Specification:
The structure is cut from a larger assembly and holds four copies of chain A. Chain A has 306 residues and is an alpha+beta fold. In chain A, the strands form three sheets. In chain A, strands 4-9-5-6 form a four-stranded mixed sheet, with no helix packed on it. In chain A, a hairpin with a 5-residue loop joins strand 1 and strand 2. In chain A, helix 3 runs antiparallel to helix 4. The longest helix of chain A is centred in the middle third of the chain and has 16 residues. The first copy, chain A, starts with 35 loop residues before the first helix and ends in a 17-residue tail after the last strand. Chains in contact: A-B, A-C, A-D, B-C, B-D. The complex binds zinc ion (ZN) (4 copies). The site of one zinc ion (ZN) has 8 residues of chain B, from helix 1.
């Protein structure tokens, strides 16, 4: 079963049918409820797994995502997951079909906009005995996923052993900060997506710290989950092509690429049979505590509530 | 060829890309007569049927004239008697809300209501699947309707007008080349509606070369403010049963209440007694007004021309 | 064919007493009744029936109705057929209704507090997260889905509006309601649909003409709820159609006084058996239903009706 | 398909019922390229040629826009420099009362001159053979011209209009989304002529989302009260050597005195010395104004839509 939230994007008109392009990872029961293709298209992130090894033989993999924000980009083009008070500006929902707009409105709990879409679609002819049950299928699937990830849904089993503080100052004191308050403000599905994409900088398991990176690559500010380093210039993150070129093919866009000139093949062969260190930018931020007694190694998503 | 659907309502389609709809149109829709409407739609919307009034010359040389019979029961009163509503009350007489938007657009064009058609424009432009293919179909419907209207509008550019014929719907001074209040009301109608009224409502009198042929001695309809209405100018309304109608299929999910009249006696033997006799039909034709054919004229023409008002 | 009765789920929350609720076959007929005849009888003291309205030539159409199962000798909370949202926990003995039935009942009356209390109470059990979490979630999901089906305010919930139904027939001819209708509006969408299904209108104005079916209501809508008492005089004789109805708990001991007739009625039996029978019963007649000139009153698929 | 003639002047046909006429529209008339005028008719009437301006980027992608070179000699002065006359001076620039009928009717419609076209109808109606061919041909010409104009008039019912493009001809405040006197005059123009100016006159600046591409450093045309004119906003006019042979011969009988220019001296050896190098054309393109492409746009769209300003 497709678990990508954006799997329900269809055309409210009956004739044209649109099976949204979803990567094969959509059907996996991983913590994610979004596919890699859609995560790239909308939240401009790529899914990856961070494997943590012990000393002798045991490796457990956590999830992580790498953002796709160029260093040159600035402003509203750096936010990966916008906040509910600015998302309608970062996302150009107007040019996003109608089903995608409905899903986005539901993700951010904008029932008013959803009802406006409802009214607009009720006015048109061929809605009652046609578009109805189609908008209903979209809404039902989206709400099902959102309540699956919402810990407050009725009788919704919620994990509570593990804690996640996106502010590392007082994390060892068992307490978050302003970023953590903003995180709590988010919708359950968005909170889960952030907890998946953004790996914790520190990992306190059984009182043992396992600091992974020495500096956070992202920040949770008011604008949202920004792909900005809190020190000096932004990280060089080259993105080549063929990820979102599905964008309207008639939309003429300019792009300032940065090419290297010169023969690199001799240098390449000089040092070729070496393990290559990847140059992506992972999403590292915050602190995660496993709390000794727990069930961290459970192969089934359960909502995590701080 | 002359076998194009000339019924104005032939363009009715679905503004969505599904639910393909072929508007039920009677065969007469393809005939090049001046009706510009099919019998099926004439019955369904304007509740009239397409008859023909043959005027016989004494020697042999008969000629025909279009005439319609209305389908208004004598029991019905109010806005249920209006056959062709005026441009003001039509939105009330016709339940435009309860019909396909294509029919609504055609109707709004028939009454020169630009605001309503533009509102339909905007409502459709608020649709996701609008620019894909619905734009082309709605534009086609508008183009066909406008073309029909220009065909019937005598004020359209290079619109040939046969002014040899004068029709007055108030026969008081019609003999004095003059109309009345009903005629002024009739002038306000759109060209298509004017032609439809002329086709449907035969004149009581016909003046040809000073010869006055009086067909009926009393009008069966009236052009009042509400529009062209099926009601006698005095006394109770004419008994008019119709039985079969468009209510068949139509709206099978809508439950409607009708009180009907029926006879409860054996009539087969009475029928057999009066079996092989000429039958006088008990319909109600639309008779009203006066019509003059000037000594010099082209009244016996085949191609329709938008006859202009007095 | 999918079970439509709202009480269809009712599954033990312990995964030990596994049993299937005794829904009657009519449970699988989507006829606007989202409850089966057996459950309607057991819980709401009503039996399903169809009221056929004939014209004078051929075309007859059917209309749902219900007969209540309240004896004339009953008084107080025993006469209430459908309790209001503020007294149901008193009329219904929800304690002796397992917990799935209690959950369904709490949802029917929008008593989310009691629903959450049931959930919190059941979270303690050591067998919770294994399977009872999912069983409770399934029951809740089915119940909420049915309620949305019958609730016209749900998102994109197509709602019929060419049909008006009042229960205080004083200004119904004025297209206006009354205190009974104000109480009716307070009900949950499912319960409003159930009342409209069970309580036939004594008047049926089909766009010009009043079809008066009964000349007095056999039920009322008061604060206590939908009640089987007559608006005037002693209650209607209703001999419970005998033991036909059911029995629930063999262990529970209860005394019932039953009116007995005496005499050899067999001779009169055939003498009148040579004739057509008029059924006594007691249908639910109350209020005024108007069908406008334009409508889809003969629409097969059920759609919620909103006043 | 490509068998419908999109040129507006294609409908030109003699109103008389005897003498035939075949408009010499160029093959380019059959392409749906946004131009609704063919290259030869553009040359004959508006004194412009049809060129394509290709804009490349550093990579292996490119896109082409339309542009036109005017055919106004440097020595021309007065109303001879006007390429597209305004609605007021057009009857003074064009010699309408010389190009028989039909073409005159199209010209009157292009400038929304209802009175003049009605007068044309009035004059034509008195002809002996009016109800014969003449009325048919005149009606066909009017219908074709009206359809062409509606295709471009953004204010037509259900007429889709693009609004991701913003075109100005005033530049001084184009960076502030605001036009000026030239833009105000441009708005007064007919929709077809607005589209024709947009096609012919390439923008001096091209601003896509945020990057500004400057094509020319000085406009070559102007939009003044007399219309779109081929005068520079500078000193002596650009030297434009008219190719006399290319320009049609029009009227063989009419005797016109033309003071042509002539270069003297042998130049074949110079050509041989400079044969092989890419030649930079000496045409004079139409550059003026400022064009903005919204970040969300459908610029690379095949089907033409009227580009009404926001
Ligand atoms: Zn996806
Ligand atoms: Zn028809
Ligand atoms: Zn049941
Ligand atoms: Zn041409």
């Amino acid at each position: 079963v497709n678990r990508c939230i954006f799997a329900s994007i269809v055309s409210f008109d009956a004739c044209i049918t649109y099976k949204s392009p979803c990567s094969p990872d959509a059907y996996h029961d991983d913590g994610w409820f979004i596919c890699n293709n859609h995560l790239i298209k909308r939240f401009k992130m790529s899914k990856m797994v961070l494997p943590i090894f012990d000393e002798d033989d045991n490796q457990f993999k956590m999830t992580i995502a790498r953002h796709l924000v160029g260093n040159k980009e600035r402003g509203i083009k750096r936010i990966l997951i916008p906040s509910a008070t600015n998302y309608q500006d970062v996302f150009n929902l107007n040019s996003m079909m109608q089903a995608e707009q409905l899903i986005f409105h539901l993700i951010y709990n904008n029932e008013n906009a959803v009802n406006t879409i409802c009214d607009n679609l009720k006015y048109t002819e061929g809605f009652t005995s046609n578009t109805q049950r189609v908008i209903h299928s979209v809404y039902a699937t989206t709400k099902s996923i959102l309540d699956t990830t919402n810990p407050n849904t009725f009788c919704s089993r919620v994990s509570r052993d593990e804690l996640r503080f996106f502010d590392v100052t007082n994390a060892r004191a068992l307490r978050g900060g302003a970023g953590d308050q903003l995180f709590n403000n988010y919708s359950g599905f968005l909170q889960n997506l952030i907890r998946r994409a953004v790996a914790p900088e520190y990992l306190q398991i059984d009182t043992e710290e396992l600091r992974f990176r020495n500096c956070a690559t992202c920040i949770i500010d008011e604008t949202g989950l920004v792909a900005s380093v809190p020190d000096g210039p932004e990280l060089y993150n080259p993105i080549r092509s063929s990820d979102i070129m599905r964008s309207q093919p008639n939309r003429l866009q300019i792009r300032n690429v940065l090419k290297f000139e010169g023969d690199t093949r001799e240098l390449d062969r000089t040092l070729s049979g070496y393990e290559e260190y990847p140059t992506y930018v992972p999403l590292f931020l915050g602190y995660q505590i496993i709390n000794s007694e727990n069930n961290f190694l459970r192969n089934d998503f359960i909502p995590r509530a701080n």
